[PDB]
């Protein structure tokens, strides 16, 4: 149908525009191999979302970070996994690197129940230092205790981190271009549960008061369990991206990113990632800021 082809061509350009807006704001030259990711997202014709993010370390700005979230209502998770891995393979072929897939392979095992997947994403964090570049994948699972246990066994180990095992749904994979790979498990708390007394006992009690303040403006909180034995990275799903400066004490580099995105044609919400110790400071020096746009027919 003519409406369909016109819409498809439009969504393709809008995705490229979203990526280009981010890249052109923060990197005067695009970081290699960004075009392969552009090819990947434009090959995904079903409904999706894109994430563009910045990682700030004092005055250092790392901005070639993009993810695609598969959001076609058909629930064809295995197909999307395969599409994502095909993309990873092209990256391997063009750059001339071999990715270490072992953690993902072990996680998937041989009997993975794809109907238990609720989120799948694939993307990049590209650096001029090739070895430090990575491919990324997140898989969120629901009601799948066997795979939660498997992900737990695959990461750093048991205690500590075990105190939040029952809150884990999201599993993240990093695949570095130097053949090093990582897995992380994320414990989450949803907004509707923020004020429950057992949540204070099981979760909030083990974090400083400063960690709790941004929850006033968040719909979801999560934290990585295996990495950073102490000083865990805390992630907040801000309902409105405008609220960032009210809850997080930004440095100049982060303010630059915030300022850029205030009036872009993007989704209202954002994610904010920062180490626990940063919120205890008078000024955050290390922060990750995540912005989103949806692409639907």
CA distances 242 to 51, 65, 188, 248, Å, are: 17, 21, 23, 11
**Beta pairing partners, 238:** 218, 270
CA–CA distance, 220 with 193 (Å, rounded to integer):
10
Residues facing residue 233 across a β-bridge? 275
Q: Are 77 and 51 in contact (CB under 8 A)?
A: no
C-alpha span between 104 and 56 (Å, rounded)? 28
Q: Is 125 labelled a binding residue?
A: yes
CB 88 within 8 A of CB 99: yes
39-76 burial string, b = 16+ CB within 10 Å, else e?
ebbeebebbbbbbbbbbbeeeeebbbbbbbbbbbeeee
Structural biology method used? X-ray
Backbone angles phi, psi at 112, to 5 degrees: -60, 130
Q: 67, 102 in Cβ contact below 8 A? A: no
Q: Are the C-beta atoms of residues 185 and 145 closer than 8 Å to each other?
A: no
- First-last CA distance in the chain: 13
Quickly count: other Cβ atoms within 10 Å of residue 21's Cβ.
18
Is 198 annotated for ligand binding? no
Provide the token pair at 135.
């491919």
Tokens 């626990």, residue?
A: 276
As given in the structure block, the two tokens for residue 68 are 């695609």
E-only strand ranges, the chain: 48-57, 60-70, 117-125, 134-141, 168-176, 181-190, 218-224, 233-238, 270-275, 286-295
DSSP 8-state class, residue 178: T
Nearest CA among 274, 278, 271 for reference residue 236: 271
Q: Which of 169, 184, 246 is nearest to 215 (CA)?
A: 246
Residue 181 tokens read as 């790979």
Q: Are 44 and 83 in contact (CB under 8 A)?
A: yes
The most distant pair of C-alpha atoms in the chain lies apart, rounded to whole Å, by 58
Residue given tokens 């979230």 in the structure block: 69
């Amino acid at each position: 149908m003519i409406v369909n082809v016109i819409q498809k061509d439009r969504l393709k350009e809008q995705k490229l525009q979203f990526i280009r807006n981010h890249q052109q704001a923060f990197d005067v030259e695009p970081i290699y191999p960004l075009p392969l990711f552009e090819d990947f997202v434009t090959s995904i014709e079903g409904d999706c979302s894109l994430e563009a993010s910045c990682k700030i370390e004092s005055d250092k700005l790392i901005a070639s970070r993009f993810l695609l979230f598969f959001e076609d209502k058909t629930q064809e998770w295995q197909k999307y996994l395969h599409q994502s891995l095909t993309f990873f393979g092209l990256v391997e072929n063009r750059v001339g690197v071999k990715i270490n897939y072992s953690l993902l392979q072990q996680f998937l095992g041989s009997s993975f129940d794809f109907s238990k997947v609720t989120v799948l994403s694939a993307g990049i964090d590209l650096r001029n230092n090739l070895a430090e570049s990575s491919l990324k994948m997140h898989i969120r699972i629901k009601d799948y205790p066997e795979k939660l246990d498997k992900a737990f066994a695959l990461s750093d180990g048991a205690a500590d981190g075990n105190y939040l095992k029952d809150f884990v749904n999201l599993i993240g994979f990093d695949f570095y271009f130097n053949g090093k790979s990582e897995i992380e498990i994320y414990a989450e708390v949803q907004e509707d549960d923020f004020f429950k007394p057992e949540i204070n006992n099981l979760v909030w009690q083990h974090f400083p008061k400063t960690a709790l303040q941004p929850l006033k403006a968040s719909s979801l909180f999560f934290t990585g369990l295996s990495k950073a034995n102490n000083n865990p990275v805390l992630y907040y799903h801000l309902k409105n991206r405008q609220d960032l400066t009210n809850y997080f004490k930004l440095n100049d580099t982060a303010q630059r990113v915030h300022s850029f995105y205030q009036h872009q044609d993007i989704l209202p919400y954002m994610w904010v990632g920062t180490a626990q110790k940063e919120l205890e400071k008078t000024r955050i020096e290390n922060i990750r800021l995540y912005y989103y746009k949806s692409f639907k027919m």
